[PDB]
Amino acid sequence: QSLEESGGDLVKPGTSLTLTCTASGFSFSHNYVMCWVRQAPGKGLECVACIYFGFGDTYYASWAKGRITISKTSSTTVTLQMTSLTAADTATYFCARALGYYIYGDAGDIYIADYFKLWGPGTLVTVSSGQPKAPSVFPLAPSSKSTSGGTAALGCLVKDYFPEPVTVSWNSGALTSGVHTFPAVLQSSGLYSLSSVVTVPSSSLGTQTYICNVNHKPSNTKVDKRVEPK
Amino acid sequence: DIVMTQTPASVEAAVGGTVTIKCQASQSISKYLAWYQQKPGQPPKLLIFEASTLESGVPSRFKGRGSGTEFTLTISDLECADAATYYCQGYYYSSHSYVFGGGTEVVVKRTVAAPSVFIFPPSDEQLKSGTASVVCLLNNFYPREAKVQWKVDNALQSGNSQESVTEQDSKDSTYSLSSTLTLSKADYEKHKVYACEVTHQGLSSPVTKSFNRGEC
Amino acid sequence: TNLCPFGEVFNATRFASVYAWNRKRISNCVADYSVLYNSASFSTFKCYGVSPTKLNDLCFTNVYADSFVIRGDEVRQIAPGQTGKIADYNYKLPDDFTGCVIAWNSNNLDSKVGGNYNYLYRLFRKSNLKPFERDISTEIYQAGSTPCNGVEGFNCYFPLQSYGFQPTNGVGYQPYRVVVLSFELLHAPATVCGPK
Ligand SMILES: *[C@@H]1O[C@H](CO)[C@@H](O)[C@H](O)[C@H]1NC(C)=O
């Protein structure tokens, strides 16, 4: 009743990477069908490949020409291997589960695996010549020009990181109200920049403490930065 | 070989309203069509399967209808949390292929809200690295469309700024925008007045937030 | 060749509740499955792990006909890998299921004006039902720290609830009769065969 994915990372163009979909709570029996669905950042979903445990065969997408190989490694593991990785393969990859069954019709017998009920959180595959860089965090100081109507705005600037994702929390998750963490924008440098802000009461500036917790898992860079008025 | 044309690219309605999303198949897919809800950073969530059957736990205001080559998803009594991206997926049993629609974004219409503008001077720590970033914050406004123009000593700046917009808030149906102006430290010390001009539908006249370098 | 008595299971006057689902073994006979998958009386006829046409051409060591009654919007729950109250606490099919699932509307028989409450289902259970498991405990369930002694109370609940089957109900809440055929092959000699 669970689907966990693994294997995504930064890979140089033209290399090959394998992705692993792990099943939890159920077995990859002959009644199930596994498919890998890929969506690029800010784009729709496309089906890459499918495996049919009932027949022991596979189906691959039209844009793929031998470049994709999906295999059943265990009763709870399914792998997806991609070669000749290009920039158009930079995307988030999901593994989805579909139930297959037979029905009778006038043509004859029909095998139906129509929809995906169970999905996984997904893994991100980035294909570029760049290298993993940890972010630099700078304070967005809550000055008086950051105060309006008894409420002050403060935050942190997460700048020059590669690759995604970065995770920003405030006061180790204690402060979640009024927090706006903007999506990252690829800079002209070829890197990513991100800003997180939060509106807090002005009277709590000198009393309360505000620390942003920045998490760059690809570079194992945990940085907690304190923001106070300048 | 099979295409799923989903239209329009975006649908809007106020709270309690109704939105309709159309999905057309190039060839007949019988009743095998599905609808998925997706929120950013999350896997797609199944809403309708077999083109009319409600998934358990999904409210009845999500209704799927149609067959052959024409399908519709209607969301009545719109809630604030309904703001997401919706996809239609068809299944062609002959080719064993899964085709997804282009996608539709649902925008929760609400009253026009003026942005709250804040400007943040670059931190001294960043300056030591050799770069300067000035951040302009547009907080809790609607509609999303907003123009941010950076003026340095009253000179319009272009090519050195980037902007991002948060997704619609599930509690306020509002938007937040951030504009970051990146300059080298040499240019930052060459000028004094740094301004952020914001023009919005809820703003009678453009509002400028500015600071002078070396003063606080 | 005495024919397999599928009419006994399918044409039964009374059907069991889903929690107490009935099981009938079919053995030493020939079964004509064409009369089943051709009939338009069935709203659901889905076979998992085996094609309907090959059913005639294959022999199996044992065949099991499980019969019960549920409500419409729950028919989807009799399938491998399904989740819900029926699939978790009343009747669970295995992931490697081999067989067929047949369901037909029975509002004209299992519904009564003012409500038919003879059909029950289990709401609570401490653990999910194992595949092909039957529970008829009808004991006072505990969902709180406070213990219990078979006495209904604040956190003491009866685990079974009856469907309210009325002809004015929606299709999703109307009674559907469900028969699941399980075709299992062991080392034992084959007993059930089809034609050819
Ligand atoms: C029920 O009885 C009718 C009339 O004899 C028969 O034709 C039909 O096949 C039976 N239904 C079954 C076996 O499902």
XYZ file of C-alpha atoms and ligand atoms in Angstrom:
656
model
C 0.000 0.000 0.000
C 3.051 2.225 -0.464
C 5.389 3.115 -3.330
C 8.804 4.625 -2.569
C 11.218 5.783 -5.280
C 14.992 6.195 -5.194
C 17.973 6.806 -7.452
C 17.527 10.411 -8.595
C 20.575 12.687 -8.619
C 22.639 14.984 -10.828
C 24.083 13.045 -13.770
C 26.294 14.308 -16.580
C 24.752 14.434 -20.075
C 25.179 11.209 -22.015
C 25.514 9.031 -18.900
C 23.078 6.361 -17.696
C 21.113 6.149 -14.446
C 18.874 3.499 -12.906
C 15.824 4.325 -10.784
C 14.264 2.014 -8.200
C 10.590 1.779 -7.228
C 10.093 -0.125 -3.966
C 6.761 -1.673 -2.970
C 5.661 -1.712 0.672
C 2.626 -3.570 1.988
C 1.989 -5.513 -1.231
C 3.703 -7.827 -3.703
C 4.402 -7.389 -7.419
C 2.011 -10.177 -8.351
C 0.576 -11.034 -11.770
C -2.451 -8.780 -11.158
C -0.462 -5.520 -11.093
C 1.073 -3.202 -13.680
C 3.882 -0.746 -12.925
C 4.512 2.367 -15.015
C 7.088 5.150 -14.774
C 5.572 8.611 -15.280
C 7.842 11.615 -15.841
C 7.001 15.316 -15.571
C 9.390 18.166 -16.317
C 9.481 21.212 -14.000
C 6.342 23.203 -14.765
C 5.060 20.740 -17.370
C 2.608 17.879 -17.735
C 2.969 14.170 -17.056
C 4.158 11.641 -19.635
C 4.336 7.859 -19.393
C 7.849 6.510 -19.965
C 7.575 2.731 -19.667
C 5.311 0.038 -18.251
C 5.804 -3.518 -17.000
C 3.048 -6.147 -17.055
C 3.772 -8.756 -14.385
C 0.915 -10.920 -15.655
C 2.494 -11.474 -19.075
C 6.157 -10.854 -18.248
C 6.423 -8.232 -21.007
C 6.957 -4.474 -21.208
C 5.720 -1.421 -23.091
C 7.872 1.619 -23.853
C 7.045 5.154 -24.941
C 7.279 6.237 -28.570
C 9.917 8.931 -27.968
C 12.126 6.213 -26.449
C 14.138 4.048 -28.870
C 15.870 1.371 -26.819
C 16.971 4.151 -24.465
C 14.607 2.920 -21.718
C 14.716 -0.432 -19.926
C 12.259 -1.302 -17.148
C 12.851 -4.558 -15.284
C 11.458 -6.476 -12.314
C 14.349 -7.074 -9.911
C 12.417 -8.575 -6.977
C 8.861 -9.220 -5.824
C 8.921 -5.732 -4.245
C 11.402 -3.858 -6.487
C 11.161 -2.512 -10.045
C 13.987 -0.678 -11.819
C 14.005 1.897 -14.620
C 17.250 2.386 -16.556
C 17.813 5.376 -18.845
C 20.731 5.847 -21.245
C 22.050 8.732 -23.365
C 20.694 11.201 -20.823
C 19.921 14.606 -22.343
C 18.508 17.850 -20.968
C 15.002 16.846 -22.084
C 15.230 13.953 -19.593
C 15.623 16.423 -16.696
C 12.409 15.803 -14.750
C 10.740 14.244 -11.717
C 9.986 10.533 -12.089
C 7.054 8.720 -10.474
C 6.269 5.012 -10.360
C 2.552 4.228 -10.447
C 0.580 1.043 -9.808
C -2.387 -0.123 -11.883
C -4.639 -3.148 -11.442
C -5.044 -5.359 -14.507
C -8.069 -7.545 -15.189
C -9.846 -9.410 -17.980
C -13.291 -8.670 -19.425
C -15.265 -10.322 -22.247
C -16.449 -8.372 -25.336
C -17.417 -9.030 -28.921
C -13.840 -8.974 -30.177
C -13.015 -11.477 -27.432
C -10.980 -11.160 -24.234
C -9.631 -7.754 -23.203
C -6.963 -6.968 -20.603
C -7.619 -3.628 -18.891
C -5.181 -1.615 -16.761
C -6.838 1.779 -17.013
C -5.777 4.048 -14.130
C -3.121 4.571 -11.451
C -4.488 4.635 -7.905
C -1.188 4.370 -5.993
C 1.693 6.768 -6.663
C 5.056 7.465 -5.092
C 6.537 10.724 -3.804
C 8.929 10.685 -6.760
C 12.611 11.302 -7.428
C 14.198 14.166 -9.348
C 16.623 13.456 -12.197
C 18.780 16.410 -13.251
C 20.922 16.111 -16.384
C 23.439 18.934 -16.784
C 27.169 19.612 -16.873
C 26.975 21.637 -13.655
C 28.176 20.520 -10.248
C 26.487 20.370 -6.830
C 26.973 23.627 -4.930
C 25.692 24.313 -1.424
C 23.628 27.494 -0.970
C 24.678 30.736 0.672
C 22.104 32.097 3.128
C 21.847 35.815 3.851
C 19.442 37.552 6.247
C 16.535 39.702 5.097
C 16.685 42.042 8.069
C 13.334 43.276 9.513
C 13.851 47.037 9.489
C 11.173 49.700 9.928
C 10.715 49.736 6.145
C 9.784 46.060 6.626
C 7.044 47.032 9.121
C 3.499 47.990 8.121
C 0.378 47.988 10.282
C 2.095 46.624 13.378
C 3.390 43.652 11.366
C 6.988 43.157 10.246
C 8.412 41.135 7.358
C 11.659 39.185 7.717
C 13.259 36.285 5.921
C 16.323 34.592 4.486
C 17.815 34.604 0.986
C 18.999 31.182 -0.205
C 21.339 31.923 -3.103
C 23.715 30.054 -5.460
C 22.757 26.417 -5.020
C 22.594 23.434 -7.378
C 20.714 21.112 -7.644
C 17.177 21.270 -6.293
C 15.595 20.804 -3.809
C 16.242 23.024 -0.796
C 14.091 22.925 2.335
C 13.437 26.004 4.476
C 11.880 25.891 7.942
C 11.429 28.624 10.545
C 12.348 28.102 14.215
C 12.720 24.346 13.591
C 9.092 24.163 12.475
C 7.729 26.117 15.446
C 6.733 29.077 13.241
C 4.560 28.105 10.268
C 1.961 30.906 10.221
C 2.630 33.708 7.752
C 5.571 31.909 6.117
C 5.966 32.328 2.349
C 8.782 30.285 0.776
C 8.991 31.267 -2.881
C 9.866 28.760 -5.623
C 13.440 28.798 -6.869
C 14.409 30.639 -10.056
C 17.375 29.504 -12.161
C 19.783 32.437 -12.262
C 21.826 33.542 -15.263
C 24.812 32.020 -13.435
C 23.272 28.615 -14.151
C 22.366 28.203 -10.472
C 19.226 28.527 -8.358
C 18.145 31.189 -5.871
C 15.331 31.066 -3.323
C 13.781 33.444 -0.797
C 11.669 32.640 2.261
C 9.800 35.329 4.209
C 7.426 35.477 7.169
C 5.235 38.239 8.600
C 5.467 38.497 12.394
C 4.174 40.950 15.010
C 6.345 44.049 15.287
C 6.333 44.070 19.101
C 7.928 40.592 19.112
C 11.029 41.732 17.202
C 13.055 42.495 20.324
C 11.485 39.651 22.315
C 11.125 36.625 20.036
C 13.835 34.874 18.053
C 13.577 34.028 14.349
C 15.922 31.446 12.816
C 15.484 29.979 9.332
C 16.530 26.340 8.894
C 17.931 25.706 5.404
C 18.395 22.114 4.212
C 20.317 21.268 1.032
C 20.250 17.472 1.087
C 22.327 17.030 -2.136
C 25.304 18.756 -0.468
C 24.370 17.753 3.119
C 24.413 21.458 4.009
C 22.343 22.218 7.098
C 22.551 25.947 7.843
C 20.492 27.745 10.498
C 20.655 31.544 10.251
C 19.355 34.099 12.755
C 17.559 37.226 11.514
C 17.108 40.229 13.818
C 16.532 43.938 13.136
C 19.495 45.939 11.867
C -0.791 8.068 -31.685
C -3.472 9.106 -29.184
C -3.703 12.730 -28.031
C -5.674 14.127 -25.086
C -6.513 17.801 -25.631
C -7.357 19.460 -22.303
C -8.837 22.955 -22.287
C -8.715 25.653 -21.064
C -5.208 26.044 -19.626
C -6.750 27.768 -16.589
C -10.216 27.967 -15.025
C -11.330 30.484 -12.407
C -14.332 30.730 -10.090
C -15.151 32.253 -6.726
C -15.730 30.188 -3.593
C -18.890 28.168 -4.135
C -18.638 28.474 -7.919
C -18.327 25.819 -10.604
C -15.439 25.140 -12.992
C -15.538 22.882 -16.049
C -12.503 21.215 -17.648
C -12.860 19.576 -21.067
C -10.738 16.663 -22.296
C -11.036 15.367 -25.867
C -9.493 12.127 -27.115
C -8.255 11.804 -30.690
C -9.875 8.356 -30.899
C -12.587 6.725 -28.814
C -11.334 5.387 -25.480
C -14.750 3.996 -24.397
C -15.219 4.753 -20.660
C -11.525 4.467 -19.709
C -10.664 8.038 -18.733
C -9.347 9.283 -15.388
C -8.961 12.634 -13.623
C -6.070 13.535 -11.313
C -5.529 16.408 -8.885
C -1.963 17.600 -8.319
C -0.649 20.188 -5.869
C 2.938 21.470 -6.200
C 5.619 19.125 -4.919
C 3.130 16.265 -4.589
C 2.211 13.125 -6.544
C -0.990 13.223 -8.608
C -4.093 12.291 -6.612
C -6.748 10.166 -8.302
C -10.228 11.719 -8.351
C -12.251 9.902 -11.036
C -11.700 6.545 -12.721
C -13.711 5.001 -15.565
C -14.610 8.625 -16.415
C -17.605 8.818 -14.064
C -16.832 6.814 -10.896
C -15.923 8.777 -7.772
C -12.888 7.561 -5.853
C -13.662 6.795 -2.215
C -13.015 9.782 0.033
C -13.359 12.345 -2.778
C -16.225 14.839 -2.293
C -19.207 14.585 -4.631
C -18.655 18.107 -6.001
C -15.994 16.540 -8.252
C -18.012 14.975 -11.075
C -16.712 13.289 -14.224
C -18.913 12.839 -17.284
C -18.565 11.812 -20.909
C -17.515 8.924 -23.118
C -16.185 8.171 -26.583
C -13.911 11.101 -27.417
C -15.389 13.783 -25.115
C -15.112 14.111 -21.331
C -15.687 16.826 -18.739
C -14.704 17.307 -15.103
C -16.935 19.703 -13.166
C -16.059 21.081 -9.728
C -19.032 22.815 -8.104
C -19.158 24.485 -4.681
C -15.533 25.500 -5.127
C -13.419 25.544 -1.971
C -10.191 27.430 -1.354
C -8.198 24.175 -1.200
C -9.361 23.212 -4.714
C -6.677 25.483 -6.231
C -4.343 22.988 -7.928
C -3.545 21.437 -11.314
C -5.893 18.850 -12.816
C -5.038 16.237 -15.444
C -7.084 13.882 -17.615
C -5.599 10.474 -18.456
C -7.008 8.196 -21.143
C -6.382 4.488 -21.666
C -6.464 2.826 -25.092
C -6.752 -0.917 -24.501
C -5.776 -1.692 -28.104
C -2.335 -0.073 -27.763
C -1.942 -0.427 -23.957
C -0.934 3.245 -23.841
C -1.498 5.922 -21.195
C -1.929 9.477 -22.503
C -2.159 12.472 -20.167
C -3.812 15.781 -20.931
C -1.957 19.066 -21.028
C -3.296 20.142 -17.649
C -5.550 22.810 -16.155
C -4.954 25.161 -13.225
C -7.869 26.157 -10.983
C -7.741 29.718 -9.630
C -9.983 30.642 -6.696
C -11.479 34.044 -7.488
C -11.716 36.502 -4.598
C -11.799 40.220 -3.865
C -8.950 42.350 -5.187
C -6.285 42.812 -2.505
C -3.503 45.381 -2.622
C 0.034 44.027 -2.126
C 2.109 44.934 0.911
C 5.465 46.193 -0.368
C 8.658 45.725 1.646
C 12.233 46.341 0.497
C 15.289 44.645 2.004
C 18.791 46.118 1.603
C 21.592 43.630 0.939
C 23.252 42.193 4.023
C 26.809 43.231 4.851
C 27.788 39.553 4.905
C 26.761 39.140 1.260
C 28.722 42.258 0.280
C 31.932 40.695 1.616
C 31.474 37.917 -0.957
C 31.443 40.508 -3.755
C 27.751 40.604 -4.736
C 24.693 42.588 -3.659
C 21.089 41.355 -3.707
C 18.103 43.635 -3.081
C 14.798 41.865 -2.412
C 11.384 43.469 -2.938
C 8.438 41.691 -1.315
C 4.846 41.814 -2.584
C 2.717 40.213 0.128
C -0.855 38.893 0.009
C -2.312 40.411 -3.151
C -4.880 39.408 -5.774
C -5.082 39.044 -8.755
C -1.664 37.537 -9.501
C -0.714 40.010 -12.242
C 1.674 42.637 -10.880
C 4.478 44.739 -12.363
C 7.686 45.328 -10.394
C 10.200 47.837 -11.768
C 13.585 48.431 -10.142
C 14.881 52.011 -10.205
C 18.475 52.741 -9.174
C 19.008 56.493 -8.773
C 15.723 56.835 -10.710
C 17.210 54.766 -13.568
C 15.105 51.808 -14.691
C 16.991 48.517 -14.380
C 16.633 45.470 -16.619
C 18.374 42.143 -17.131
C 19.587 41.766 -13.527
C 16.353 40.844 -11.710
C 14.284 37.691 -11.268
C 10.826 37.096 -9.819
C 8.880 34.151 -8.432
C 5.267 33.841 -7.285
C 3.955 31.534 -4.585
C 1.006 29.283 -5.288
C -2.419 30.574 -4.301
C -2.807 30.462 -0.528
C -5.252 27.808 0.656
C -6.461 30.089 3.481
C -6.583 33.507 1.777
C -6.722 32.689 -1.975
C -3.931 35.272 -2.242
C -0.547 35.544 -3.949
C 2.932 36.542 -2.799
C 5.669 37.809 -5.117
C 9.380 38.425 -4.554
C 11.695 40.451 -6.798
C 15.449 40.049 -6.309
C 17.830 42.596 -7.856
C 21.362 41.193 -8.111
C 24.314 43.536 -8.625
C 28.057 43.384 -8.116
C 29.383 45.197 -5.057
C 31.235 47.688 -7.272
C 27.990 48.840 -8.897
C 26.119 48.762 -5.575
C 28.469 51.340 -4.042
C 28.286 53.457 -7.224
C 24.649 54.417 -6.528
C 22.608 55.666 -3.576
C 18.830 55.405 -4.077
C 17.398 51.912 -4.625
C 13.662 51.779 -5.300
C 10.960 49.213 -6.058
C 7.953 50.483 -8.024
C 4.874 48.248 -7.805
C 1.854 48.640 -10.084
C -1.166 46.490 -9.237
C -4.874 46.382 -10.022
C -5.658 47.175 -6.381
C -3.237 50.122 -6.382
C -4.738 53.465 -7.420
C -1.257 54.744 -8.295
C 2.046 52.835 -8.326
C 3.640 52.599 -4.876
C 7.417 52.923 -4.543
C 9.470 51.551 -1.651
C 13.026 52.869 -1.571
C 16.075 53.095 0.668
C 19.342 55.031 0.531
C 22.583 53.072 0.787
C 24.495 53.664 4.004
C 21.499 54.950 5.979
C 19.304 53.154 8.515
C -20.187 -35.469 -16.926
C -22.350 -33.952 -14.200
C -22.410 -30.178 -14.602
C -21.009 -27.818 -11.986
C -23.910 -26.459 -9.853
C -23.299 -22.757 -10.413
C -27.053 -22.147 -10.385
C -27.149 -23.058 -6.698
C -24.784 -20.195 -5.844
C -26.009 -17.642 -8.383
C -29.768 -18.312 -8.149
C -29.922 -18.631 -4.351
C -33.045 -17.221 -2.707
C -31.161 -15.672 0.236
C -27.583 -14.386 0.325
C -25.267 -14.069 3.308
C -23.910 -10.881 4.831
C -20.461 -9.794 3.687
C -18.908 -10.338 7.129
C -20.335 -13.894 7.172
C -19.726 -14.489 3.457
C -20.747 -17.951 2.281
C -18.292 -20.337 0.622
C -19.252 -23.301 -1.569
C -16.710 -25.753 -2.973
C -17.269 -26.838 -6.586
C -15.615 -30.150 -7.430
C -15.821 -33.185 -9.724
C -17.790 -31.538 -12.518
C -17.715 -29.643 -15.812
C -18.422 -25.908 -15.719
C -19.781 -23.907 -18.656
C -18.421 -20.399 -18.113
C -19.818 -19.113 -21.424
C -23.309 -18.869 -19.906
C -21.794 -16.596 -17.237
C -19.619 -14.101 -19.123
C -22.212 -13.788 -21.904
C -25.107 -12.883 -19.595
C -25.988 -9.188 -19.425
C -27.482 -9.564 -15.934
C -24.095 -8.846 -14.326
C -22.945 -5.264 -13.819
C -19.399 -6.414 -12.980
C -17.590 -9.401 -14.529
C -13.821 -9.082 -14.093
C -11.313 -11.942 -14.197
C -7.874 -11.601 -12.596
C -4.964 -13.872 -13.476
C -6.816 -15.830 -16.177
C -8.761 -15.037 -19.354
C -12.507 -15.834 -19.491
C -12.205 -17.841 -22.720
C -9.378 -20.032 -21.429
C -11.505 -20.905 -18.366
C -13.188 -23.613 -20.445
C -9.857 -24.972 -21.717
C -8.259 -25.228 -18.245
C -8.759 -27.644 -15.358
C -8.341 -26.699 -11.703
C -7.910 -28.687 -8.506
C -10.447 -26.663 -6.528
C -13.003 -23.981 -7.344
C -14.548 -21.824 -4.622
C -17.740 -19.785 -5.006
C -17.894 -17.080 -2.333
C -21.272 -15.348 -2.160
C -22.416 -12.267 -0.260
C -24.258 -8.949 -0.582
C -22.783 -5.446 -0.395
C -23.860 -1.991 -1.542
C -23.116 -0.578 -4.992
C -20.237 1.833 -4.398
C -18.435 -1.014 -2.575
C -18.341 -3.477 -5.497
C -15.036 -1.919 -6.581
C -13.526 -3.117 -3.284
C -13.600 -6.813 -4.293
C -10.325 -6.710 -6.230
C -6.675 -7.322 -5.281
C -4.932 -4.335 -3.747
C -8.133 -2.508 -2.812
C -8.623 -0.522 0.386
C -11.777 0.175 2.351
C -13.991 -1.139 5.116
C -15.187 -4.153 3.109
C -11.714 -5.053 1.836
C -10.011 -4.432 5.194
C -12.508 -5.883 7.686
C -15.052 -8.000 5.765
C -13.623 -9.736 2.675
C -10.043 -9.460 1.397
C -8.630 -10.854 -1.858
C -4.916 -11.687 -2.179
C -2.452 -9.891 -4.427
C -1.845 -13.110 -6.400
C -5.584 -13.739 -6.790
C -6.583 -16.037 -9.652
C -10.284 -16.113 -10.415
C -13.245 -13.964 -11.371
C -15.514 -11.448 -9.638
C -19.187 -11.185 -10.614
C -21.647 -8.638 -9.242
C -25.224 -7.796 -10.177
C -27.779 -5.340 -8.832
C -30.281 -6.957 -6.462
C -32.470 -4.019 -5.451
C -35.580 -5.901 -6.614
C -34.863 -8.665 -4.067
C -32.681 -7.366 -1.214
C -34.375 -3.977 -0.677
C -37.592 -3.298 1.234
C -39.751 -0.203 1.659
C -38.901 1.098 5.105
C -35.477 -0.538 4.890
C -33.952 -4.019 4.730
C -31.465 -4.471 7.581
C -30.691 -8.201 7.308
C -27.352 -7.494 5.602
C -24.520 -6.484 7.935
C -20.898 -5.401 7.619
C -18.004 -4.932 10.029
C -16.928 -1.365 10.811
C -14.005 -1.950 13.194
C -11.211 -4.466 13.567
C -7.866 -4.291 15.335
C -6.030 -5.644 12.277
C -6.791 -5.843 8.572
C -8.322 -9.114 7.418
C -5.949 -11.637 5.908
C -6.865 -12.797 2.387
C -9.818 -15.211 2.381
C -10.429 -14.683 6.111
C -13.858 -14.713 7.774
C -14.696 -12.930 11.038
C -17.985 -13.535 12.869
C -16.782 -12.540 16.341
C -19.636 -10.040 17.030
C -17.892 -8.971 20.247
C -17.860 -5.513 21.815
C -14.944 -3.684 20.182
C -12.574 -1.362 22.057
C -11.307 1.891 20.537
C -10.114 3.532 23.763
C -7.736 3.023 26.659
C -10.606 2.228 29.029
C -11.114 -1.570 29.105
C -14.423 -3.352 28.620
C -16.280 -6.476 29.738
C -18.702 -7.157 26.895
C -20.851 -4.164 27.881
C -21.714 -1.370 25.459
C -20.383 1.922 26.744
C -18.657 5.212 26.036
C -15.749 3.546 24.206
C -17.365 0.089 23.878
C -18.925 -0.443 20.442
C -20.772 -3.153 18.581
C -18.586 -3.962 15.553
C -21.389 -4.682 13.057
C -23.697 -2.260 11.242
C -26.587 -3.091 8.928
C -27.099 -1.663 5.465
C -30.292 0.306 5.084
C -31.508 -1.179 1.802
C -34.434 0.816 0.410
C -35.647 0.961 -3.215
C -35.388 4.773 -3.172
C -31.642 4.626 -2.457
C -29.103 5.741 -5.014
C -27.395 3.184 -7.218
C -24.232 3.401 -5.118
C -26.235 2.527 -1.990
C -28.387 -0.180 -3.606
C -27.729 -3.853 -2.785
C -25.497 -5.803 -5.159
C -25.017 -9.568 -4.995
C -21.377 -10.627 -5.369
C -19.998 -14.053 -6.303
C -16.231 -14.615 -6.418
C -14.921 -17.705 -8.209
C -11.469 -18.797 -7.023
C -9.627 -21.221 -9.320
C -6.769 -22.823 -7.387
C -4.369 -25.482 -8.676
C -2.521 -27.762 -6.244
C -0.646 -31.039 -6.631
C -3.956 -32.817 -5.968
C -5.790 -34.383 -8.933
C -7.936 -32.002 -10.956
C -11.663 -32.125 -10.213
C -13.322 -29.200 -12.035
C -12.933 -28.912 -15.800
C -14.610 -26.984 -18.570
C -15.500 -28.164 -22.062
C -12.550 -29.101 -24.280
C -30.832 -19.187 -12.961
O -31.890 -19.938 -13.515
C -32.155 -19.705 -14.880
C -33.454 -20.387 -15.247
O -33.304 -21.782 -15.134
C -30.950 -20.203 -15.674
O -31.114 -20.003 -17.058
C -29.739 -19.391 -15.238
O -28.570 -19.832 -15.879
C -29.517 -19.451 -13.724
N -28.519 -18.470 -13.386
C -27.201 -18.685 -13.195
C -26.719 -20.109 -13.338
O -26.423 -17.785 -12.919
